[PDB]
Swiss-Prot record, chain A:
Family: Belongs to the RNA polymerase alpha chain family.
Enzyme class: transferase
Comment block on domains: The N-terminal domain is essential for RNAP assembly and basal transcription, whereas the C-terminal domain is involved in interaction with transcriptional regulators (such as CRP) and with upstream promoter elements.
Protein name: DNA-directed RNA polymerase subunit alpha
Coiled coil (residue ranges): none
Role: DNA-dependent RNA polymerase (RNAP) catalyzes the transcription of DNA into RNA using the four ribonucleoside triphosphates as substrates. This subunit plays an important role in subunit assembly since its dimerization is the first step in the sequential assembly of subunits to form the holoenzyme. Part of the processive rRNA transcription and antitermination complex (rrnTAC). The complex forms an RNA-chaperone ring around the RNA exit tunnel of RNAP. It supports rapid transcription and antitermination of rRNA operons, cotranscriptional rRNA folding, and annealing of distal rRNA regions to allow correct ribosome biogenesis.
Keyword line: Acetylation, ADP-ribosylation, DNA-directed RNA polymerase, Nucleotidyltransferase, Transcription, Transferase
GO-annotated molecular function: DNA binding; DNA-directed RNA polymerase activity; protein dimerization activity
Disulfide-linked positions: none
UniProt organism field: Escherichia coli (strain K12)
GO biological process, alphabetically ordered: bacterial-type flagellum assembly; bacterial-type flagellum-dependent cell motility; cell motility; cellular response to cell envelope stress; DNA-templated transcription initiation; intracellular iron ion homeostasis; nitrate assimilation; regulation of DNA-templated transcription elongation
Alpha N-terminal domain (alpha-NTD): annotated segments: 1-222
Reaction(s) this enzyme catalyzes, per UniProt: RNA(n) + a ribonucleoside 5'-triphosphate = RNA(n+1) + diphosphate
EC assignment: 2.7.7.6
Curated annotation (Swiss-Prot), chain D:
Domain of life: Bacteria
Subunit structure: The RNAP catalytic core consists of 2 alpha, 1 beta, 1 beta' and 1 omega subunit. When a sigma factor is associated with the core the holoenzyme is formed, which can initiate transcription. The rRNA transcription and antitermination complex (rrnTAC) consists of RNAP, NusA, NusB, NusE (rpsJ), NusG, SubB, ribosomal protein S4, DNA and precursor rRNA; S4 is more flexible than other subunits.
Protein name per its UniProtKB record: DNA-directed RNA polymerase subunit beta'
Family recorded in the similarity comment: Belongs to the RNA polymerase beta' chain family.
Gene assigned in the entry: rpoC
Organism: Escherichia coli (strain K12)
Full-protein positions shown: 495 to 543 of 1407
UniProtKB/Swiss-Prot annotation, chain G:
Function: DNA-dependent RNA polymerase (RNAP) catalyzes the transcription of DNA into RNA using the four ribonucleoside triphosphates as substrates.
Region forming the signal peptide: none
Family to which the UniProt record says this protein belongs: Belongs to the RNA polymerase beta chain family.
Protein name: DNA-directed RNA polymerase subunit beta
Phylogenetic classification of the source organism: Bacteria, Pseudomonadati, Pseudomonadota, Gammaproteobacteria, Enterobacterales
Domain of life: Bacteria
Uses: Co-administration of salinamide and rifampicin or salinamide and myxopyronin suppresses the emergence of resistance to both antibiotics.
Region of the whole protein represented: 1194 to 1293 of 1342
Processing and modification events after translation: Acetylated on several lysine residues in the presence of glucose.
Subunit structure: The RNAP catalytic core consists of 2 alpha, 1 beta, 1 beta' and 1 omega subunit. When a sigma factor is associated with the core the holoenzyme is formed, which can initiate transcription. The rRNA transcription and antitermination complex (rrnTAC) consists of RNAP, NusA, NusB, NusE (rpsJ), NusG, SubB, ribosomal protein S4, DNA and precursor rRNA; S4 is more flexible than other subunits. In pull-down experiments interacts with CedA.
Modified residues (N6-acetyllysine): 7
Length: 222, 121, 27, 49, 100, 98, 100, 221
């Protein structure tokens, strides 16, 4: 009438966006239960940060062009939709970007901030093709969870973008046999995680387990 | 066979149903037309009850002669005359196609609604 | 003046005048 | 006519047809059961075909 | 673009006339979102001619069916171009191939 | 199935009556008459009715959409016309499937 | 040739794989056909087809509602619908639709 | 951002003494399946209990043997024995003896009484005796375990019987729609439960939830 409890036993970091987590040991049937519950929770309820608004100097709306820039404003907004940023201490921040001269404009050109981290500095935003061209913009970053279209949430020259707050991209899991002293009926569970590099695997596992445990409180009823 | 065969059976086109009624009774023409229509409809696997064809046939034959008048009027007049112990009347039934049967009705509003407004009016 | 149920953004305005008289500030 | 007009088709027919077929030497063949609820338990647990 | 095709996409895309095609070969001199400038090769110039070609592009125009028409450059700065090459894409076109 | 016996009909045996005259033949009656292998039956029809300006219930018979006998005040001409007309139309637009 | 290309890509030559249910995690009982296909979006959008009305404007000679979504019109109740209501026996619904 | 909805409507309906239906509302989108599947799996395959595992019959040496004086057969006798519910206190292996003579129904009330052991349904039918000459003598083995174990996975005249340790007879769930002030994307969970009478459905639900919750203790903070 007693069960053995699992623990974290290994964390393997393939790269900055790929990870593996191992839970051991498990009784019969508990591996699949925990795996499916954790996969379902991890893919929908994790928090993150995203870009929500933008302002450019001479730009009125997004269906226009700018002299000396190869892309349209709409393509620039689509490019900005995929910027990954880590923020601590606040739930809202504003960044400034300034650039001049011929060449590409990357994420490394953003003015440095004390409590903001950029994880992929080589992300490309636009191109300048004239030697007498310059660009300056202001970008607003917020925190949340889920997917909020701009139309649902709702001066001339302020442009809104759709927000995808989730930092998780792919989840997989496997169940294998375990080696324990004199026992041959125990399993181990391996979870494979693919993200954008703005969340820690161990913290994600703890957060998902906390959400599930807090949801399970209502079933001990009267 | 096909759609034109059905559309020609209901309008009493001459190749006979007229002689079948005049010589063997309407009870025979009922079965004749029912069988002929169901022959076309049963090749394709269509199920229709026999009542509806009988209804259309009854509506087809509605006049009489002894000019041309309504069958029910003649029957009522004969009943009234026989109620007084007098001599009634003798009649021979007719038969028309649906297009001709519709245009010969006691109501002129419905006939004008059907078709050929100017002649009816 | 916008028909019911239709939204959007204004991207172009055109003004047409003949050889007549008078003109507006926006024109 | 007399025949009904509400009749299942396509997916429903395929599903019921798949449930009601039988195979040879399938998993769990040859058991004696106390009722339909035991059959549902055995199918859901993965112990019978 | 389609992963599975038949091989007739380029013909339709080029003969329709919705793209921009180079009249003479040369080298790309200036390009932005709405204009292309080509410097013509030496052996294709008439006497007494400056020798540049200018292409202006169509931007956000409505069609007969209230749809959108838009052109986008697909060449970089300092590239060499031959005759009959695609310089810009039209609606439903990907690098000179029809894409619906 | 769903008519009313017009005249005297009896069991195949001599002087033995199976179904009384003027009865509505439901499933049980049909099974009973099929058990004894009934040869043929006589029924009432709409065309042989003496009612003027309309018809009467027993000459019509069962109402196929419900199961019981027909009620008074029902427009049977429109129903008959629709029943005949519909199958020809449905036959039309399914030709290209073959 | 398709099977040779599949083998070069390290994929099964039948074109079928194993799938799992995302709501329970259970494996479907048969292999399923999975692949890539080219899809199109046609110009029949439900935003251009939904319409409703309670009261509005009427014609001049025949004081009946106008027709067309552009001018906020009503739907037509034709001869065949009248036949259907006659076959049902619904006299009050028919009178309500014909007059008020 | 860390706040999630909590249910505020709990409805319980008792169809019988051992059959219940529970409704829970409202939930976040997708959580009904997440909770229902896990609860169903734990209830189906992991609850502990007691069951009959083996039987010995004096006059029978083979499963297909025929015993005179009884209407039923050995197969049906085993089937009746499989549905017998019992509670054992302070032990894990018990042998029970049954001796009966006469002509009439032989039920569970005829088993020799032995306290630390209790019978849920005294009127559960075991067999019938037809003649005065016939008599029956038999022995029953009861153990403790988890889930369901078929006899085919384990194979002096001893007959093996399928073991049903879990007290749950039937479990099912369903998910429907719910809204809270125009937020019309939320879930509603409905659960149907039937037990064998040893415990009531609500106790089983609470026990399963406790078992699931105690497995996450290392990670939850």
């Amino acid at each position: 009438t007693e069960f053995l409890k699992p623990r974290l036993v290994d964390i393997e970091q393939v790269s900055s966006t790929h990870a593996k987590v191992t839970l051991e040991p498990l009784e019969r049937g508990f591996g699949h239960t925990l795996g499916n519950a954790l996969r379902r929770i991890l893919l929908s309820s994790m928090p993150g940060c995203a870009v929500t608004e933008v302002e450019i100097d001479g730009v009125l709306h997004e269906y226009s062009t700018k002299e000396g820039v190869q892309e349209d404003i709409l393509e620039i907004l689509l490019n900005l939709k995929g910027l990954a940023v880590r923020v601590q201490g606040k739930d809202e921040v504003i960044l400034t970007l300034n650039k001049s001269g011929i060449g590409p404009v990357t994420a490394a050109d953003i003015t440095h901030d004390g409590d903001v981290e950029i994880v992929k500095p080589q992300h490309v935003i636009c191109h300048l093709t004239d030697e007498n061209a310059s660009i300056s913009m202001r970008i607003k970053v917020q925190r949340g969870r889920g997917y909020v279209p701009a139309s649902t949430r709702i001066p001339i020259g302020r442009l809104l973008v759709d927000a995808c707050y989730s930092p998780v991209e792919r989840i997989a899991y496997n169940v294998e046999a375990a080696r324990v002293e004199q026992r041959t009926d125990l399993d181990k569970l391996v979870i494979e995680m693919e993200t954008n590099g703005t969340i820690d695997p161990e913290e994600a596992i703890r957060r998902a387990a906390t959400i599930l445990a807090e949801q399970l409180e209502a079933f001990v009823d009267l | 066979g096909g759609l034109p065969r059905v559309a020609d059976l209901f309008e009493a086109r001459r190749p006979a149903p007229h002689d079948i009624l005049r010589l063997r009774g309407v009870h025979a023409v009922t079965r004749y037309i029912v069988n002929e229509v169901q022959d076309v409809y049963r090749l394709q696997g269509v199920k229709i009850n026999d009542k509806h064809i009988e209804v259309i046939v009854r509506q087809m034959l509605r006049k009489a002669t002894i000019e041309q008048v309504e069958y029910s009027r003649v029957k009522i007049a004969n009943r009234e005359l026989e109620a007084n112990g007098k001599v009634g009347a003798t009649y021979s039934r007719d038969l028309l196609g649906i297009t001709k049967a519709s245009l010969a009705t006691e109501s002129f509003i419905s006939a004008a609604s059907f078709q050929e407004t100017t002649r009816v009016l | 003046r916008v028909p019911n149920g239709v939204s959007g953004t204004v991207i172009d305005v055109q003004v047409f005048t003949r050889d007549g008289v008078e003109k507006d500030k926006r024109a | 006519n007399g025949e009904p007009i509400i009749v299942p088709s396509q997916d429903v027919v395929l599903g019921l047809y798949y449930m009601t077929r039988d195979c040879v030497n399938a998993k769990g063949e040859g058991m004696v059961l106390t009722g339909p609820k035991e059959a549902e338990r055995l199918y859901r647990s993965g112990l019978a075909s | 673009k389609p992963l599975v095709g038949t091989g007739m996409e380029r013909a339709v895309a080029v003969d329709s006339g919705v793209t921009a095609v180079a009249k003479r070969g040369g080298v790309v001199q200036y390009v932005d979102a709405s204009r292309i400038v080509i410097k013509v090769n030496e052996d294709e110039m008439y006497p007494g001619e400056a020798g540049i070609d200018i292409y202006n592009l169509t931007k956000y125009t409505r069609s007969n069916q209230n749809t959108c028409i838009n052109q986008m450059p697909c060449v970089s700065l300092g590239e060499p171009v031959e005759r009959g090459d695609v310089l810009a894409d039209g609606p439903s076109t990907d690098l000179g191939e029809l894409a619906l | 199935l769903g008519r009313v016996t017009a005249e005297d009909v009896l069991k195949p045996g001599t002087a033995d009556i199976l179904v009384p005259r003027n009865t509505l033949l439901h499933e049980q009656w049909c099974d009973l008459l099929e058990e004894n292998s009934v040869d043929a039956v006589k029924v009432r029809s709409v065309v042989s009715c003496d009612t003027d300006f309309g018809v009467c219930a027993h000459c019509y018979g069962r109402d196929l959409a419900r199961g019981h006998i027909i009620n008074k005040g029902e427009a049977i001409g429109v129903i008959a016309a629709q029943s005949i007309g519909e199958p020809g139309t449905q036959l039309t637009m399914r030709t290209f499937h073959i | 040739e398709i099977k040779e290309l599949l083998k070069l890509g390290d994929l099964p030559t039948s074109g079928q794989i194993r799938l799992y249910d995302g709501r329970t995690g259970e494996q479907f009982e048969r292999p399923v056909t999975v692949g890539y296909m080219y899809m199109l979006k046609l110009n029949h959008l439900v935003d251009d087809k939904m319409h409703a009305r309670s009261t509005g404007s009427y014609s001049l000679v025949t004081q009946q509602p106008l027709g067309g979504k552009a001018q906020f019109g009503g739907q037509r109740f034709g001869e065949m619908e009248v036949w259907a209501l006659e076959a049902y026996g619904a006299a009050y619904t028919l009178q309500e639709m014909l007059t008020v």
